[model samples]
Target: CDDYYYGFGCNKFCRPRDDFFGHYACDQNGNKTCMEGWMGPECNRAICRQGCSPKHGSCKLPGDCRCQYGWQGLYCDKCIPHPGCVHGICNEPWQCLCETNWGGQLCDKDLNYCGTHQPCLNGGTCSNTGPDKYQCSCPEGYSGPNCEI
Candidate 1:
């Protein structure tokens, strides 16, 4: 009946766990069960294998795996890909670094989607905002990003 088994172990040998129910001596029959959250004959090992995610972190508690900003999904491992960029592919999350002439979540929208009215006509560049929302940037037309043609 070591006092260490009750979550009060010495720092030199063992450390205290989060919670401890009780301690039980080992038996040859291996029929003994550790406390609720502890394991082993000394009830030391904690059974905190909840929502542990390699990509994120070990959710030893309950909501430790909750995703944060710039990330999505169950464990926050996945991110929203860029869609509207003219130069390279925007595969990462909201990085703000878009292609040469494209802009959007996935860089899928063109920079010249809007016509002359939006100043994106005649080889002008276009910048995407949302799904179909875009702004025009005509070369020799207006000072604003998307103003009069």
Candidate 2:
């Protein structure tokens, strides 16, 4: 029986390979088998878990996520949202999404509908039945939809 050998009656000798910080085992057939998250001819690569964010994360030890600035999470995959930004997401710190009708850095400004679009014609005013529904009141001289003769 030999210390670093395996296979029938320990007749097979395992190669004295260096693995830096990787862990591996000799199979019953005397072949090197690397542990999970490790792969190489010598089983020395301690790689991060699959699907890690390439732009935001890196790893020195197996299954670990070493994150970059402005990113945080188990995998460093999400950006930090701006403070008080309730209605939208942020691609970078202090920057918020949804810059349209919902304005401001916090997406809090409600752009008044009727005043912005001005759907009415020839001295008419449109009321905000709601944001999407605009009810228009044509002048006495104008007659049909949106004020026509």
Q: Rate the local accuracy (lDDT) of all candidates.
A: 0.49, 0.73
Q: Model 2, range 1-149, lDDT digits (tens) per residue? A: 67787776777886545457556777767888887777777788777867778889987778888788878888888888787786678777566895556655687754556777786788877776643456778878896656755
Misplaced by over 4 Å in model 2 are 6-20, 92-94, 113-149
Error of 1 at 2 (Å): 16
Q: For residues 80-103, write the lDDT of model 1, one tens digit per residue.
A: 544333344323565545564555
Residue 14: error of model 2 in Å?
A: 3.3
What is the alpha-carbon lDDT for the whole of candidate 1? 0.49
TM-score, per-candidate, Cα-based: 0.32, 0.53
Residue-level lDDT for 145 in candidate 1: 51
Model 2 sits at a Cα RMSD from the real structure of 8.1
Which parts of model 1 are misplaced by more than 4 Å?
Answer: 1-52, 62-70, 80-94, 97-101, 104-110, 115-149
Tell me each candidate's RMSD, in Å, in order: 10.6, 8.1
- Judging by TM-score against the true structure, name the best candidate: 2
